């Protein structure tokens, strides 16, 4: 029933993992701005941390943030089932992997390169600048972007 | 006067709103005067309705539209735009909200305000595209009361819709505002502005 | 035995049609006109109407 006030004791407008995680946006829906952290995953992370979901990302104590960060890079440590990740069973090692922020893109690029090297159809398509997933293009996508 | 209960006991409010006055959503259809000679018989009121949702056979004959409660018509109008189309419950809800808003501000019967708005947004003289060959020149022409009513109903709804396009101001509030503007002839309302423009055009063409 | 009732009916019709076709094919010289099918107890009764009865009989 009561509004939780705070004049400005908890400082707004923050940065987490290189880039911007801004205020007035919710604790979960500002983690989406970080590449690799989508929605459901973000929510899960938040739950693991134990943060109020009625909270702005602009607030948050540092310890909580640290905990969240910890959760992020290594989720198999925690109570996350780890079978909803990017690289589950993996391309190389055979481990549960979920890359984040500036790493996922790099990993993707690497994968693409590998594919190209192998000389599989998808790689060839990528090289060309075309549709991999059999979406036959007599029409559709006519601006090259 | 006299509350008597049954086996399945009914809430007190319902009991209160019964025999003496057939209230609308929760206030009287009585008072509420058509303050215009013409648009009588073409604005309904009179017959006391409870909800702005009847079954209705109003597009059947010719003037079956005129014997429909104005609230219902308004709701129908609101119902427009294809994404929203159908879903009359929503429209009804919106109407209710609007009514409540009206009640809150400047008091009165909201119904009365609505009636006033309807009266004061219906254009008196229109222009038809008559060329006498094919030229885009226009001719000054009188307006039917039904037509006046209908256009007025349309215009307010349109305005409301426009207001709603990217806004916190939930349609209902906007509608209420429009009504207020209309009843007390403002020129800040959209419908009224349109009407004025039409009038000007007519004057020019004459 | 053990087939859906509507389906069975359909099949019956189909069979009748087939029979008719067959008759048209064969009994053209005899001048075939119409078939009737009666599925009574024990025996199925096929009634043929043709212009040359004697020929049909053989």
């Amino acid at each position: 029933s009561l509004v939780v006030q705070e004049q400005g004791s908890f400082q707004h407008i923050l940065r987490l993992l290189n880039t911007n995680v801004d205020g007035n946006i919710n604790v979960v829906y500002a983690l989406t701005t970080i590449r690799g952290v989508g929605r459901r995953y973000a929510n899960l992370v938040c739950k693991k941390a134990d943060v109020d979901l009625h909270k702005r990302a602009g607030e948050l104590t540092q310890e909580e943030l640290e905990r969240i960060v910890q959760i992020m890079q290594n989720p198999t440590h925690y109570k996350i089932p780890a079978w909803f990740l990017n690289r589950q069973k993996d391309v190389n090692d055979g481990k549960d992997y979920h890359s984040l922020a500036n790493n996922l893109e790099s990993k993707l690029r690497d994968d693409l390169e590998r594919l190209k090297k192998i000389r599989s159809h998808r790689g060839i398509r990528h090289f060309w600048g075309l549709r991999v997933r059999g979406q036959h293009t007599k029409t559709t996508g006519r601006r090259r972007a | 006067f006299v509350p008597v209960e049954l086996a399945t006991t009914i809430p007190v409010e319902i009991q209160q709103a019964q025999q003496e006055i057939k209230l609308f959503n929760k206030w009287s259809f009585e008072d509420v005067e058509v303050k215009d000679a013409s648009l009588v018989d073409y604005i309904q009121i009179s017959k006391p309705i409870y909800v702005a949702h009847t079954a209705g056979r109003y597009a059947n004959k010719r003037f079956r539209k005129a014997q429909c409660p104005i609230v219902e018509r308004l709701t129908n109008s609101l119902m427009m735009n294809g994404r929203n189309n159908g879903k009359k419950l929503k429209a009804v809800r919106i109407v209710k909200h609007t009514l409540e808003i009206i009640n809150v501000l400047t008091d009165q019967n909201p119904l009365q305000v609505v009636v006033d708005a309807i009266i004061n947004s219906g254009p008196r003289e229109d222009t038809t595209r008559v060329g006498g060959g094919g030229a885009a020149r226009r001719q000054a022409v009188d307006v039917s009361p039904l037509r006046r009513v209908n256009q007025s109903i349309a215009l307010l709804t349109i305005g409301a819709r426009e207001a709603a396009f990217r806004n916190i101001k939930t349609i209902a509030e906007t509608l209420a505002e429009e009504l207020i503007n209309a009843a007390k002839g403002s020129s800040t309302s959209y419908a009224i502005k349109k009407k004025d423009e039409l009038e000007r055009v007519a004057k020019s063409n004459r | 035995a053990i087939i859906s009732k509507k389906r069975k009916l359909v099949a019956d019709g189909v069979f009748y049609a087939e029979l008719n076709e067959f008759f048209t094919r064969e009994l053209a010289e005899e001048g075939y006109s119409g078939v009737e099918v009666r599925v009574t107890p024990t025996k199925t009764e096929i009634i043929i109407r043709a212009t040359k009865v004697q020929d049909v009989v053989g």
Partner: protein, 58 residues
């Protein structure tokens, strides 16, 4: 029983459809009797087109 067919054999033309429908009448009657009597009843009163069917016994 419903069927929908394009009236065309070839496909060219304004796309016009058929609604070939076959209506099935199914009706049942319940009797408490000795079986022989039932059989007697049902051995006669057979008309071509109508399927007579007996469940018999509980």
């Amino acid at each position: 029983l419903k069927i929908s067919t394009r009236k065309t054999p070839n496909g060219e033309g304004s796309k016009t459809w058929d609604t070939y429908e076959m209506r099935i009448h199914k009706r049942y009657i319940d009797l408490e009797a000795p079986a022989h009597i039932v059989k007697r009843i049902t051995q006669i009163t057979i008309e071509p087109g109508v399927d007579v069917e007996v469940i018999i016994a509980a």
